[PDB]
Structures are given as structure tokens and as C-alpha cells.
Structure 1
Amino acid sequence: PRAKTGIVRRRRHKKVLKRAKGFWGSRSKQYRNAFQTLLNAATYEYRDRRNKKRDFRRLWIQRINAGARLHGMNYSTFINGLKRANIDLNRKVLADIAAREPEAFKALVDASRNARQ
């Protein structure tokens, strides 16, 4: 008994191709180039899952030291002034606090200075 490859290769291929959306060129229309894009695509996806965390952390920091600086301190001094006191252990989300509620974050700064010198 024979067994053509009928319908199989079409579906596989279509699954691949349907992945290609904002895909410029023949990346989105010719199978091979599509699949091939999908390799390096893998690479980027997987690494970016890990990377996005680095990114965000950086973001939050970049805000936090700004807040710090708005009063007369910095990020080093500020976080450190929450380490000396087991009191404040926010760390995460702090950026949102310096971005939305200024007064609160002022209070935190004042606390940091008070738990240092």
C-alpha cells in the first residue's frame, strides 16, 4: 500500500505561516523563509522572557534614584537607609510610590535619613 503525503505538509506549512503577522517580505509568505525566521525568533522569545526582568528592575531603579534626588539624597543612600532599619522592606513597587504619591515617598526619604546619621 502506498501513502502519499497529501494534506499533511500543507497543514504543517500553514501552521508555520499563520505565525507570520507583522512579518515583512517573504518572511510572511514563503514557507522556508518563514520557518527560518521562526528559529531565530525562538531565540529572541526565550531570552527576552529572562531579559524583561532586568529591563524592568532597571526602570524602577531609574525612577527611585530620581525620587531620592528630589529631596537631597540618592539611590545608594536611600535603599541603604531601608536596610539599616528592618522597618522598611518595600523595595518592589517603590518606584510606583515615587511616581504617584510624592508625599508618601517624601516620608520614606525622611525615614531613611533618620535611620542613618
Structure 2
Amino acid sequence: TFSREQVFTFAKNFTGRARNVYKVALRRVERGLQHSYVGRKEKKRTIRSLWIQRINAGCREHGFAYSALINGLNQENIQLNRKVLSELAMHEPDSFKAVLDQVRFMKGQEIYANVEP
């Protein structure tokens, strides 16, 4: 069981009797800590959902689809994840478009260490 010092440190921002009354605050503190364990798990699900929505919106502006892009990347051996792709569509439109054109049309110029073999 938490001590008085621990309980009131956790409950400093609660409302009414939940702030300074031990019996009321102790039950409020334990329920809140239970919410946090569930919250950290759900955070990982929600953020990935947001990345996909932004990627899909950018793809369709050019006439493409999210599912077509993911399949196309794996065929080209490109391993950029969804967090990076989402940021490219929002802040780097030109680089995001270049990735789409390579996947769809494959018209990029290859680079070799020895330019003139």
C-alpha cells in the first residue's frame, strides 16, 4: 500500500476531496495507474493508423493507392517504414513524388562507384 507521501504526490492535481483525503485519493490513484498501462499499449496502435492515413492521402493526390505503394516498395527492395514515409509526404513533397515515380515507372538513373568503368 502506498504511503501518505506517495499518495499525495500522485494526487496533487485532482479535484475536490481527491486531493488531500487519503481514503478518497488512494482509490483514485490506483485507478489512474491502471489507465496508464492500457494507454501506453494503445498509443502504439493509434500512431500507426495516423501514418497510414497521411500516406494514403498523398498517394491518391497523384492517382495511386496506399496498398499499391506498399507492394511496389517491396519489389524494389526499399525498406523505408511508415513513420518516415508519412513525414516525407507532409514536409518533402518532391522527394515523396520521386519515390512514387520510381515504383510505378522505374525511370531512375542508376549510380555506380566507378562512373566510367
Deviations 1:4-39 (A, max 9, x none): xxxxxxx92132112113322222222122111122
Q: How does 1:1-117 map to 2 (within 5 A)?
A: 12-86=3-77, 88-91=78-81, 92-114=83-105
In structure 2, do the counterparts of structure 1 residues 49 and 109 end up closer, same or farther at CA, with 3 Å as the change threshold? Answer: same
Q: What is the identity percentage for the equivalent residue pairs of Structure 1 and Structure 2?
A: 41
Matched residues in 2 for 1:12 and 1:63: separation? 47
Aligned structure 1 segments of 4 or more residues deviating by more than 4 angstroms: none
Q: Which amino acid is the alignment partner of residue 26 of structure 1? A: R
Deviations 1:20-67 (A, max 9, x none): 133222222221221111222121111111111111111111111011
Unpaired runs of at least 5, structure 1: 1-10
TM-score (structure 1 length as normaliser): 0.79
Q: Which amino acid is the alignment partner of residue 65 of structure 2? A: N
TM-score (structure 2 length as normaliser): 0.79
Matched residues in 1 for 2:18 and 2:48: separation? 34
Q: Which amino acid is the alignment partner of residue 17 of structure 1? A: F
**Aligned-pair distance for 1:83?**
1.4
RMSD: 1.7
Aligned partner of residue 73 in structure 1, secondary structure: coil
